[PDB]
């Protein structure tokens, strides 16, 4: 009848897409990169330890100047740190103790936060006198805020645990666009270098590529076997890396529209919470649930080093725009800056 | 480098005030206890709130100590992600309507949810205070010919009331037997893999006025004492 035909058509389309993807699999990255000299061994030491948070930290974000950074903890605090001198530039108390994400504006005049209140709060840091106060409260999501990234000082893209993403205009306070299509909570998002596209990973073992202007999904990637927690673009914007609860990382290309490389090992049976790239994209840094961080050769898929200085879950990880240092946060309420 | 010295000094006395304020706030943070109120709409979860928008706040004072209760609302029924945010609360209050023993199977769903919460890897240290609401409705349904307990729990007919059971006066053995069977269903899961790091505290509540906050206070005191006794290789 009317039903049971759409399902068969969808299955046929899935088979056609799979065949088209298979027809493009000329070779593999490992075969091509056989002549590449190995990276070797990466030995990083903790250059700074930042203390002052009372509860576990979920989020951090570097500044464009590669010197200041914001961190969010469920003690009810956003702390803005100077990395070079380990001082404290700002301390902002939050109306809701439950915060899951934080962002830092590229200009540096604003920060953003959100969590188990379905509201994104924007904080102005360049007031003429007084202190930091809420300038905008974007509301309308029906689920907890998972991630938020700034586009200029008037636009922001947020992901929510209501299976939808949103693009908001800050001045009016109304969301310009809604991105639908995921069947699970959207856990992370990453902006392209040109800020024209972005990618999101959901709790359905899938990732999607969205165009900001049109508001529609262009490509979908399904290689993982469990929930996706982290996602990050390659420096040139033609690829991206994802991490999940199945304990593997995967590199997906956009032109080829399929997976290129997998980063996993037999002795790792814990999920991956954070993903980041190096300045040149040669090293891929991943935070794990076993209280450790790993460094992978992004072209040869062999582990190159371990960041082992945290006593609890590693929740957030970030690399500066200069590429000099890597900052990691954990559930033990300390930040660590490595070089 | 005079300007550099001046700005560095300004940074130092800007950090000093922030650190002083953080030291002041640390005492307030350490001196209050966070409770996670869970359950379902059918199970009540609001009459508890009555006698003390994505989350709701409640605050109450017991013997001059602070308690904060967190009601999770306006959230989807996928709790496998946002539950991890409540892994350092002192207690999870789990409210279950034991009268609805006849989705149409509330007790089995509650048992499965309790098992999932108990066996979570990030909730291995969190204790649960179990409230079994609507006992009068359960008594009325058991006394009347509404439904049979062993239609969903066939092992009930082989259950004998434990000797330690102390029912409230003016009762019938059937309602006591049903209540203790339901309670032991949760106690089995609690005792299967507790390993001494956390416990479960089951209570029977019908209409008690301001006694629920007293029960929560006593159970939190017990939780803290047991944690202190365990860390000293003494319990």
């Amino acid at each position: 009848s009317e039903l049971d035909q759409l399902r068969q058509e969808a299955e046929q389309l899935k088979n056609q897409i799979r065949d088209a993807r298979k027809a493009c699999a000329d070779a593999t990255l490992s075969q091509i990169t056989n002549n590449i000299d190995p990276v070797g061994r990466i030995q990083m030491r903790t250059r700074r330890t930042l203390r002052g948070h009372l509860a576990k930290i979920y989020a951090m974000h570097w500044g464009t100047d590669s010197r200041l950074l914001v961190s969010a903890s469920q003690d009810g605090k956003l702390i803005i740190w100077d990395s070079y001198t380990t001082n404290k530039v700002h301390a902002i108390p939050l109306r809701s103790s439950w915060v899951m994400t934080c962002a830092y504006a590229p200009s540096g005049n604003y920060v953003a936060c959100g969590g188990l209140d379905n509201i994104c709060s924007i904080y102005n840091l360049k007031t003429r006198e007084g202190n930091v106060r809420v300038s905008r409260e974007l509301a309308g999501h029906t689920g907890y805020l998972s991630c938020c990234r700034f586009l200029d000082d008037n636009q922001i893209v947020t992901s929510s645990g209501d299976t939808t993403c949103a693009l908001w205009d800050i001045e009016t306070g109304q969301q310009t666009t809604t991105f639908t299509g995921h069947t699970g909570d959207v856990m992370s998002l990453s902006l392209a270098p040109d800020t024209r596209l972005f990618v999101s990973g959901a709790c359905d073992a899938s990732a999607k590529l969205w165009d900001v202007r049109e508001g529609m999904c262009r490509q979908t990637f399904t290689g993982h076997e469990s929930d996706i927690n982290a996602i990050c673009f390659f420096p040139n914007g033609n690829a991206f890396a994802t991490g999940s609860d199945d304990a593997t990382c995967r590199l997906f290309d956009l032109r080829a529209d399929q997976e290129l490389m997998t980063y996993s090992h037999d002795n790792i049976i814990c999920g991956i919470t954070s993903v980041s790239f190096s300045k040149s994209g040669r090293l891929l840094l991943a935070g794990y649930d076993d209280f450790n961080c790993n460094v992978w050769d992004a072209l040869k898929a062999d582990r190159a080093g371990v960041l082992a200085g945290h006593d609890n879950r590693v929740s957030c990880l970030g690399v500066t725009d200069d590429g000099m240092a890597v900052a990691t946060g954990s559930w033990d309420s300390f930040l660590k800056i490595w070089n | 480098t005079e300007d550099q010295r001046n700005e560095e000094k300004a940074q130092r006395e800007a950090n000093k005030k922030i650190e002083k304020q953080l030291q002041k706030d640390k005492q307030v943070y350490r001196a209050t206890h966070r409770l996670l109120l869970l359950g379902a709409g059918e199970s009540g979860k609001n009459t508890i709130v009555k006698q003390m928008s994505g989350i709701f706040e409640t605050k109450f004072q017991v013997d001059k100590v602070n308690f904060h209760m967190f009601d999770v609302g306006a959230q989807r029924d996928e709790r496998r992600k946002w539950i991890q945010c409540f892994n350092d609360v002192t207690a999870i209050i789990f409210v279950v309507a034991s009268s609805s023993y006849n989705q149409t199977n509330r007790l089995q769903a509650a048992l499965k949810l309790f098992d999932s919460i108990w066996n979570n890897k990030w909730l291995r240290d969190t204790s649960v205070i179990l409230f079994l609401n609507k006992q009068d409705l359960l008594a009325e349904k058991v006394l009347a010919g509404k439904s049979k307990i062993e239609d969903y729990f066939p092992e009930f007919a082989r259950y004998t009331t434990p000797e330690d059971a102390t029912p409230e006066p003016g009762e019938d053995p059937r309602v006591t037997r049903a209540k203790y069977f339901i309670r032991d269903e949760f106690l089995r899961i609690s005792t299967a893999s507790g390993d001494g790091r956390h416990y479960c505290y089951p209570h029977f509540t019908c209409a008690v006025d301001t006694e629920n906050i007293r029960r929560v206070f006593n159970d939190c005191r017990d939780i803290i004492q047991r944690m202190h006794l365990r860390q000293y290789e003494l319990l």
Epitope: A205, E225, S226, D227, D245, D246 | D77, R80, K112, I117
Partner: nanobody, 128 residues
Framework: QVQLQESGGGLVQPGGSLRLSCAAS????????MNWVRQAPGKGLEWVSD????????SYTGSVKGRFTISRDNAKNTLYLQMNSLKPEDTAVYYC?????????????????????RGQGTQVTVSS
Amino acid sequence: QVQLQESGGGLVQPGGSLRLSCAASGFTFSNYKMNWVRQAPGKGLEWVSDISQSGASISYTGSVKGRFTISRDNAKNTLYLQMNSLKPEDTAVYYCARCPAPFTRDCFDVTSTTYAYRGQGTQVTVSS
């Protein structure tokens, strides 16, 4: 792409038997604990049974103990449910649900209205 395809079902006289098969692809079958869930007409999802990675632990609800049986073949990546004695209250759509994550002792969201790692389901009716 994780795929769970259910088989079996149909119309069966009271007292009859049915064998339901769940073919799983796209993930490592050995590392996950599997569940059989069902939804009756005009009702919600009900957990029916579950089995662990190696089959050591098996659980049922009180309305199916003694009658229903669950098993898994890890070599062929298949989940089997055998229904020996059937009743008019067993008319429902049966789904084959999967644990959200591997190597975990818990399963949070398998009877939810929406859930990613669940199959289409098969209709089973026992009327006359």
